A paper describes a structure:
The mtrCDE genes are organized in a three-gene operon, and their expression is repressed by the divergently transcribed transcription regulator MtrR, which is a dimeric TetR family member with a predicted N-terminal helix-turn-helix (HTH) DNA binding motif and a C-terminal dimerization/inducer-binding domain. Under physiological conditions, MtrR binds to a 27-bp direct repeat located upstream of the mtrC transcription start site in the intergenic region between the mtrC and mtrR genes and represses mtrCDE transcription, as well as that of its own gene. As in other bacterial multidrug-binding regulators, MtrR likely responds to the influx of multiple cytotoxins into the cytoplasm by dissociating from the mtrC promoter and relieving repression of mtrCDE gene expression.
The subunits of each dimer are composed of nine α helices. MtrR has two distinguishable functional domains: an N-terminal DNA binding domain with a helix-turn-helix (HTH) motif and a C-terminal dimerization/ligand-binding domain. The dimer interface is formed primarily by the burial of hydrophobic residues in the middle of a four-helix bundle that is formed by α8 and α9 of each subunit. As observed in all other TetR family members, the multidrug-binding pocket of MtrR is located in the C-terminal domain with ligand-binding residues contributed from all C-terminal helices except α9. The initial solvent-flattened electron density map revealed positive electron density in each of the four independent putative ligand-binding pockets of each MtrR protomer, suggesting a “ligand” was fortuitously captured during the purification or crystallization process. The density could be fit by CAPS, the biological buffer component of the MtrR crystallization reagent. Thus, our final structural model of MtrR does not contain CAPS. Despite our inability to refine this mystery electron density with CAPS, its location provided insight into the chemical makeup of the putative MtrR binding pocket.
Author numbering:
A (entry chain A): 8 to 72, 83 to 209
B (entry chain B): 9 to 75, 82 to 210
The structure:
């Protein structure tokens, strides 16, 4: 039963990746899945639900893989998987490059915003554990730190996709991550 | 030419409302209050209007950099970029369009090609700032210039993306100077940005 839901969302992933989210229709997804519109509707009422499910599959894969070191490993595995996992590659390609913030995509954008809030809470908890464990300074500005972490990671992703993958992500990401973590631990501009 | 600028801002406003892919030349002409023939005389297609907007953005930046040491000027230029991103409607709308309303589809392939040309321009300009800073001994002689440019663009693009994509939910005036100061400290001191 989970295989029928998976076939439809992967057909959605393929159509989104080719046409973008705004121009993708339910009929195209159903056609690409080789199913009827009614069969698609049985599992997913709309593009929002397909995109949201894609978000959950990405987050499930990440979570199914001390605390400050695990975070570092998680960031490194994330960028490796962007190069080796076709679903993670295409999903983030869609999110950053094929998902325009227009009124037409408002409900898809609302789903994306819900997942940004979730990443925010997960990073904030990582920082909290690192502070109590003395991996980070007691006067760390956690709010600025979260913005800093997300901006660093988003910049590398956006830059990699928008450049047409014109630089080696396997060599670049550990260096970007290493500088980021050094800044979080030591740079005074990230303190209250 | 004031007739050309009227057309470019009609394109900017329509791009900002509808996105680049869904905008048609007729809508731009209509919004500018001119005929399709009048528009085509100055701009053959959406790409060239987008290209002209890119140039106005670059002209604005260069006519302000024209106002000690080039490395300190670079700091000011970066700070001024994010300030006008928040205070100048043309710079706000254009970069909003670029990051959030310009999807990388086959339909937009020609627009994307224009953007790629201007990324190459920014890359060359950042490389020249880096070359000057090394020659002025503001940056180490063994700076990895290739990684540093990628590093600079990634830091700045990430902040812009984050600000727009979050719905401007944090204070850019207070956040960008911290980000810039850290970025420039890393370029000056961090060993990961060295060739060795």
């Amino acid at each position: 039963a989970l295989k029928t839901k998976e076939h439809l969302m992967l057909a959605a992933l393929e159509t989104f990746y080719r046409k973008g989210i705004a121009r993708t229709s339910l009929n195209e997804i159903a056609q690409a899945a080789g199913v009827t519109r009614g069969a698609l509707y049985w599992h997913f009422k709309n593009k929002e639900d397909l995109f949201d499910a894609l978000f959950q599959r990405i987050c499930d894969d990440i979570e199914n893989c001390g605390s400050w070191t695990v975070f570092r490993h998680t960031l490194l595995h994330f960028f490796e998987r962007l190069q080796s996992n076709d679903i993670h590659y295409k999903f983030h390609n869609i999110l950053f490059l094929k998902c325009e913030h227009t009124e037409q995509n408002a409900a898809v954008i609302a789903i994306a915003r819900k997942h940004q809030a979730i990443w925010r809470e997960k990073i904030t908890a990582v920082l909290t554990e690192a502070v109590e464990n003395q991996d980070l300074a007691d006067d760390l500005d956690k709010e600025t730190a979260v913005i800093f972490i997300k901006s660093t990671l988003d910049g590398l992703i956006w830059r990699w996709f928008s450049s047409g993958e014109s630089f080696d992500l396997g060599k670049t990401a550990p260096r970007i991550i290493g500088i980021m973590m050094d800044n979080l631990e030591n740079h005074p501009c990230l303190r209250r």
